[PDB]
Every structure is written in C-alpha cells, then in structure tokens.
Amino acid sequence: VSESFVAPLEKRAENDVPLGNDVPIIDLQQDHLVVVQQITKACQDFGLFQVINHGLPEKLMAETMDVCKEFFALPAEEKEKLQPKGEPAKFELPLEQKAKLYVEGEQEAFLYWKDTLAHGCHPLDEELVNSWPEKPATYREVVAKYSVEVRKLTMRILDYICEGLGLKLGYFDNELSQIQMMLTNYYPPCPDPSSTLGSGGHYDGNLITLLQQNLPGLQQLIEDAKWIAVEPIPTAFVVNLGLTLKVITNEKFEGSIHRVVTNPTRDRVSIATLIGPDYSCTIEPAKELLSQDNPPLYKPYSYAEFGEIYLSDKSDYDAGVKPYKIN
Ligand SMILES: CN1[C@H]2C[C@H](OC(=O)[C@H](CO)c3ccccc3)C[C@@H]1[C@@H](O)C2
Ligand SMILES: [O]
Ligand SMILES: [Sr+2]
Ligand SMILES: [Sr+2]
Ligand SMILES: [V+3]
C-alpha cells in the first residue's frame, strides 16, 4: 500500500472486531408508541440503530445500489468529468450541491482508502438533477426517486424523535434538515487492511444520516474504547445520529462514532444520506428542553463556523463543538 494511505499506529483497526449483538434493530410496523419508545431508547443509549419494515421499497433500494455500483464501474475517462481541474474535490466549505468525486483524509497526514461521489438532493429541481452524473443513463431517474423516499423516511424518524423528546412534531422540518447530501462511497480491495482505513472514526457532523450497506466494513465505537462490527442487512437502513442532534438534545441523545475498515479481496459500495442544517443556521440546545436541572451544555454557534472545524480538525471526534462547550 502507498505511504499516502498508512494510518497512524493508534488509529489502525484490529483484524478481529466482534459483531455488535446489542445494535438495536427497530421494526417500524410495530404499534406507534412501541416504535417511539424503542427509537428513543436507541437514541439515548447507542446513537446507532437499524430500521426494518421502514416503508421504503426494497426494489428501489436494490435499483439504487445497482446504479451506484454501475457508476463506480464507469471508465476513468467518464469519471474525469466529476473531477474539478483534473482531481477529486475536497470536503471543505463551500461544499457545493453539484455532483463531484471527492478524496478524504486527516491532516501525520494520510488519505482514506475511499472514492466518494457526493451531491445535494433537496429540493429536487432541473438545475440540481442536471448537475448529477450523466452516466449511467438511469442514475438521475432512480436516485431522484430514492432521495425523495429516503427523505420521507428520515422525516418520519425525526418525528418519532420529537415525540420521544417532548418536542412539537415537525421541530426539524425546517432549516435544520434543508441540506440532503447523498454520499456514495466506493472501497476497492486493499492489499494491507491492517495499515489503512476506508473511513476514519467520526461523528456525522449533520443532524441525522441513513446508511444503506450490503457488505461488512462498518464499525461503531462503544464504551471503554471498544469497536464493534455493524451487521449488514441489505434491506435495512443504519440510522447514525449526528453531532448536531447531540447538541440540540443537550446530550440527552448520543451521536454515533463509526469508521469503515478495508477488505483485501472484494470491493464495497455504501449509500449515505446526510440530512442537516443549511450553513446559515444557528445551532443550540432546544430551549424547550432546558431548565435549572438541565442547563445548556453548548452556547449558540454558526453551522458554517462549526463545519470549517469539523472538516479540518480530526484531533478529537467532537473537535467541531469543543469551542462552544459551557457548564
Ligand atoms: C467521512 N466523512 C465525514 C465528514 C464529511 O462530511 C460531510 O462533508 C458532511 C456533508 O453534509 C458535513 C456535515 C457537517 C458539516 C459539514 C459537512 C464527509 C464524510 C462523511 O461521511 C462524514
Ligand atoms: O458519514
Ligand atoms: Sr484525474
Ligand atoms: Sr450538467
Ligand atoms: V458517517
């Protein structure tokens, strides 16, 4: 493996990470109150859960994974059209909603063993969809339907979260969910998995993420610096609560800290829908939940200012919010 991809010793993954048997799997076709209670418990104790019987068509999930795999099978010459000035774009502000291929890493500087296609999805209009990949031919029609369906499911989950917290329904149906970034992640086979990371350990900086996977590689950090493997369920969504939701709930909910490990023999594609605030938003603990017993743990901050730190400073998982901590 190229020196560029060698992770610092302490960040390298151990070869045998155990299955997370305690990852909540939540059936959304249970009675309404049972769903609210199970989602609430998962948000308080874990910050990562899977949803099944979630109402999003299994056929559409399969068609979306197919067209995403088809995109990454495209020739080099086609992929160049998504590389501004001949190279992948960087995860840095301004983060544009037009489709680009991205490189990612940490500044002991190293790169993640990953190619990412990213674009905005909300609101859908001709200008946005015309900025998506031209190939495969069916990408735009399949991913347009997928993005609307994933958003509908995410807003359902945010209203379950509202009921669990005692916030009015639709609390997040505003500026706090107006950006929908779809990240299609491609992990090619890696000759030295013991030295590399597909994705470094992170909170998602946004509000909430729905992740579609069909192969192993996703790992979560739980108490006592233990990593566990998240079982791939091809017809489920992994829900990762973001650092933004951790702040707004005043740490009543956990954020998901997770990473992706490489594989020596086979490639892997994942589809992450990252929903969260516009860069113009002010983030603070929900005042409705604050009291003398529950004082705010964060001062109000600019999401844009947070974003710059979150994307550049990887010294700690919550480096993005450290400047805004109080009490
Ligand atoms: C592994 N990387 C993490 C950081 C970066 O995330 C982003 O780029 C999101 C995209 O919404 C973002 C969130 C909050 C503020 C700025 C950007 C790209 C990817 C994501 O999978 C999460
Ligand atoms: O992510
Ligand atoms: Sr190039
Ligand atoms: Sr175009
Ligand atoms: V993530």
CATH classification at residue 208: 2.60.120.330
Q: In the block, which residue shows the tokens 């480096």? A: 319
Rg of the chain in Å (alpha carbons): 19
Residue 217's alpha-carbon distances to 32, 105, 114, 210, in angstroms, are: 32, 18, 12, 16
Burial class (CB in 10 A: 0-12, 13-18, 19+), 307: buried
Residue 157: both structure tokens together: 């989950």
Cβ(251)–Cβ(151) below 8 Å: no
Residue 273: both structure tokens together: 């829908």
Pocket of ligand 2 (CB under 6 A): 204, 209, 272, 274
Phi (first) and psi of residue 226, to 5 degrees: -90, 130
Residue 323 lies in a domain: no
**Nearest atom in ligand 1 to 93's CA:** 16
CB atoms within 10 A of CB 178: 17
**Nearest atom in ligand 1 to 91's CA:** 8
> Residue 214 is which amino acid?
N
First to last CA, the chain: 46
What is the H or E stretch that residue 42 is in? helix 32-45
Domain that holds residue 130: 3-280
- Which residues, in sequence order, are CB contacts of 157 under 8 Å at separation 6+? 39, 51, 208, 210, 239
What is the H or E stretch that residue 208 is in? strand 208-212
CB atoms within 10 A of CB 82: 21
Taking alpha carbons only, the member of 132, 131, 152 closest to residue 143 is: 132
How far is the centre of ligand 1, averaged over its atoms, from the C-alpha of 291 (Å)? 32
Cβ(276)–Cβ(206) below 8 Å: yes
Q: DSSP secondary structure string, 264-326?
A: SS--EEEEEEEEE--TTPEE---GGG--SSS--SB--EEHHHHHHHHHH--SSTTTTTGGGB-
> Residue 280 is which amino acid?
S
Phi (first) and psi of residue 3, to 5 degrees: -55, -35
* Three-class secondary structure of residue 16 per DSSP: coil
Phi (first) and psi of residue 120, to 5 degrees: -70, 160
Residue 304 lies in a domain: no
- Resolution of the model in angstroms: 1.8
Q: How many CA atoms lie within 13 A of 207 on its CB side?
A: 28
d(CA 243, CA 188): 28
Residue 311 lies in a domain: no
Cβ(20)–Cβ(229) below 8 Å: yes
d(CA 311, CA 202): 10
Residue 320 lies in a domain: no
For the chain, helix, strand, coil in percent to 5 are 30, 25, 45
Residue 218 lies in a domain: yes
Q: How was this structure determined?
A: X-ray
Q: Is 187 annotated as a binding residue?
A: yes
Q: Is 185 annotated as a binding residue?
A: yes
Taking alpha carbons only, the member of 310, 244, 231 closest to residue 275 is: 244
The closest ligand to the CA of 219 turns out to be 5
The domain total for the chain is 1
Residue 217: both structure tokens together: 């590689």
Residue 316 lies in a domain: no
Give the residue ranges of DSSP H helices in the chain: 32-45, 58-72, 76-79, 126-129, 139-165, 243-248, 303-312
The closest ligand to the CA of 276 turns out to be 1
Q: Which of 207, 274, 303, 305 to mutate to test the pocket of ligand 1 (most atoms within 8 A of CB)?
A: 274
Determine how β-strand 208-212 pairs with β-strand 218-222. unpaired
